[PDB]
A paper describes a structure:
In eukaryotes, AGOs typically associate with ~22-nt guide RNAs, including microRNAs (miRNAs) and endogenous small interfering RNAs (siRNAs), to form an RNA-induced silencing complex (RISC), which slices RNA transcripts that pair extensively to the guide. Among the four human AGO paralogs (HsAGO1, −2, −3, and −4), HsAGO2 has retained the ancestral endonuclease activity that slices extensively complementary RNAs. As is typical of AGO proteins, HsAGO2 has four major structural domains (N, PAZ, MID, and PIWI) connected by two linker domains (L1 and L2), together creating a Y-shaped RNA-binding channel bifurcated by the N domain. The guide RNA also has four regions, known as the seed (nucleotides 2–8), central (nucleotides 9–12), supplementary (nucleotides 13–16), and tail (nucleotides 17–22) regions.
To capture fully paired RISC without the target being sliced, we used a catalytically dead mutant of HsAGO2 (D669A). FLAG-tagged HsAGO2D669A was expressed in human cells and loaded in lysate with a 22-nt miR-7 miRNA, chosen because it catalyzes slicing faster than any other guide RNA tested. The final map had a nominal resolution of 3.3 Å (gold standard FSC 0.143), with the active site achieving a resolution of 3.3 Å and the N and PAZ domains ranging from 5 to 8 Å in resolution. Our map revealed the centrally paired, slicing-competent conformation of a metazoan RISC, thereby providing the final snapshot for the four-step pathway of target association. Density for the RNA showed that the guide-target duplex was fully paired from position 2 to the end of the guide RNA, with distortions from A-form helix no larger than those observed for a 2- to 16-paired duplex within AtAGO10.34 This unimpeded path of the RNA duplex implied substantial movement or remodeling of the N domain. Specifically, the first alpha helix of the protein (α1) moves by 9 Å to widen the central channel. Furthermore, β3–β7 move by ~10–12 Å, together with the remainder of the N domain, to make room for the RNA duplex in the central channel. Indeed, in our model of the slicing conformation, the 3′ end of the guide and its binding pocket within the PAZ domain have moved ~63 Å from each other. More broadly, when considered in the context of the series of changes that occur over the four steps of target pairing, these changes at step four continue the monotonically increasing separation between the MID-PIWI and N-PAZ lobes, with widening of the central channel. This widening successively increases the distance between residues of the central gate (residues 353–358 and 602–608 of L2 and PIWI, respectively), from 8 Å without bound target to 9, 14, and 25 Å after steps two, three, and four, respectively.19,30,48 Thus, these observations extend previous analyses indicating that binding of target RNAs with increasing complementarity entails successive opening of the protein, achieved by the movement of the N, L1, PAZ, and L2 domains.
Residue numbers in the entry: 23 to 119, 126 to 151, 154 to 155, 157 to 174, 176 to 185, 189 to 244, 247 to 270, 277 to 292, ...
Write the structure that this text describes.
Amino acid sequence: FKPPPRPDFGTSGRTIKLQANFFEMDIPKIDIYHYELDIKPEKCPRRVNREIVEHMVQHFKTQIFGDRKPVFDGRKNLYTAMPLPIGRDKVELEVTLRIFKVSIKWVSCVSLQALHDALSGRLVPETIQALDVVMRHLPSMRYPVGRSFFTASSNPLGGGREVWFGFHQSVRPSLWKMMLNIDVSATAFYKAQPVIEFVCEVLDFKSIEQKPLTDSQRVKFTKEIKGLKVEITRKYRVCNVTRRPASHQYPHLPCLQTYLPLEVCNIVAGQRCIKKLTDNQTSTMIRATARSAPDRQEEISKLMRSASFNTDPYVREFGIMVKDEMTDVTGRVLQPPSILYGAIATPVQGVWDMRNKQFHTGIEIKVWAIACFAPQRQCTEVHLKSFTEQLRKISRDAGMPIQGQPCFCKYAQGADSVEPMFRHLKNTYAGLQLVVVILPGKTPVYAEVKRVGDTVLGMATQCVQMKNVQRTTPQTLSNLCLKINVKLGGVNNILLPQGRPPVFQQPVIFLGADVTHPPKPSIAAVVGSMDAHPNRYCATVRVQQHRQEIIQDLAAMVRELLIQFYKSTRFKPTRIIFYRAGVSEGQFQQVLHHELLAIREACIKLEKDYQPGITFIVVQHHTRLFCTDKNERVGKSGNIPAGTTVDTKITHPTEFDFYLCSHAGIQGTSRPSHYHVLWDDNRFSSDELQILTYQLCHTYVRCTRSVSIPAPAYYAHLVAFRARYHVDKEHDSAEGSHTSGQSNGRDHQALAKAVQVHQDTLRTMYFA
RNA sequence: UGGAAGACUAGUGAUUUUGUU
RNA sequence: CAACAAAAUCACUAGUCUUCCA
Ligand SMILES: [Mg+2]
């Protein structure tokens, strides 16, 4: 039903001063008059319409507009701080800049007093849209493309191109009052200048002084220059650039198309590079624009102050004022869970290592095989011997002792060759635990391998690149053994028992789920814990409707996971925690209605009188956050430290939600995960639930580092990814076609039974 | 397919306005 | 008050490039 109110703002963790790129407000309570306008010819651009409106205000200033500074959305909506005399008869005018006709009609008055009332009641709308239209009308003229301010910055990229900068804007509500926000997002420009400069810089001869050019020198300038307007050093447009020079079509060089020389013509300035560029030009701007988090905060702080909207009367007509400094917040660092190995590790900065640490319950690998598909000359038997030696060494060091040589090794080619050999393997060796596979590149047979590995034969198929075999390193094989161990039913590590909050002091199951869509089936996966720590997650998966977000068959999946938990522990979980990734903000009211009830239904199916406490959470932008203290800047990227939580001055004013930056920022500016708590029967405090959501980011087995979202969610994502790798035989066959519309039901049932993982594989974390 | 993460291109959904019902 | 089409914003999802990790 209704999502719960915020129980409290929390107290646990460190204290850090933090800065969000939002901006404070003044928001006067005046009523802005809003009118509707019709402009002919309607096909003209919005910027041309705004220019026509300005020209009409200037031309008809005597009796119609006066000194007013109206703001126009571009097509229909116009706004003013004072009423116009046009109310409410037919008003039409003409403008000549190239001749246009316009009309004006008054609409209504958007009251900011209603905005103030909604800010402290009526739990807020025409008001926000009108404010968004008003707040960036004039600056958008400085950008026709875009609706944001620009700076007239110079920086030659290549082939006659340059870079000019500008930042995009937004306005969102928050506690007390609204908040404007700015984020730097720039573009690129094709250079405009005299054609002599094009011959010098772009053609790049020995000097200005040449001849009918070859392909490369021509394409350096002739191909790039197409698309720009030109004038006399007479407005014209470039429609073609000919390989044949002006003499055959400095006329002896390649010319532009009517034709123009290269000595008395200047390209028109102010034209942004509209066209999408070649692959080589994608990194030409990153050569001079690769920047980190401080090189976004500093740039925003410089440019917003350089704009200085408060100083100009032309935007102070409405009286709206925005503070220069960006928003200040207080953040808290959640403590990390100590990870216990069969050795206690602290996830320091969201990273820990397997140095002198072994798995909690290792698996003794006795009978194991290798199925190589790389070329024999490129991957010889000595390479396989070296890979075997390093794999055995790393597995021995990790508490998963691989014993002796592999019992089987054969070279093979073709995708269909995996199925017989593996069958023969399980026919010729009993107790075959591990089945290593070697594949070069993105070959399709990998999918076939997993289609033999998990679905039908039930063997722990592990795959590795040819380059990794040729270039084995300790880290690669360590991370590979980390998933080989859980593929064989082992347990890598467990959360420390005493370091967990009271939610863990009773039997509890931590469900998680995710859904992935095609680039036909939409795969929804649900994972559930199987022990009290937990580390071992059983997985269920269902193909469902195209692009559907709702997990249609969640009740049966939760029933299966609860049955497995009861059989594994002979106890019923008194609490249920259900994470849910992949949900859009517009669907929460539906999701909270549906999936929660289904979970309850599963409990009703497990036992008549069974009633645990369910917690329903959803995990998810432009809401960048940066440090304020110089000492708190971490690493090369300078991102906020891992585990920081923010739940004040930028989040929802009433509902329970919080931003959490669980993962460390390798590059750029990290996007914190926004956890919106949609339901809480257990009535967790902010501290306990935030600590739980942060600690479940460290039960992830595929690597020893903190992940962005909790392990129950990304495990469902991995299960869906593996199920995608698991049966579309229309593409596999030479041809595929049938009566679509009903036969896709047959394909759906086929996918359902194909993704039904084998029993030997069902009881272990194959999805690693 | 050793693992994690942030820049561009494209699909689904929620909302304000406009046109139709 | 709801659906379809257009503009804008927002959130997810997918692809192409790109950075780091013993
Ligand atoms: Mg996902």
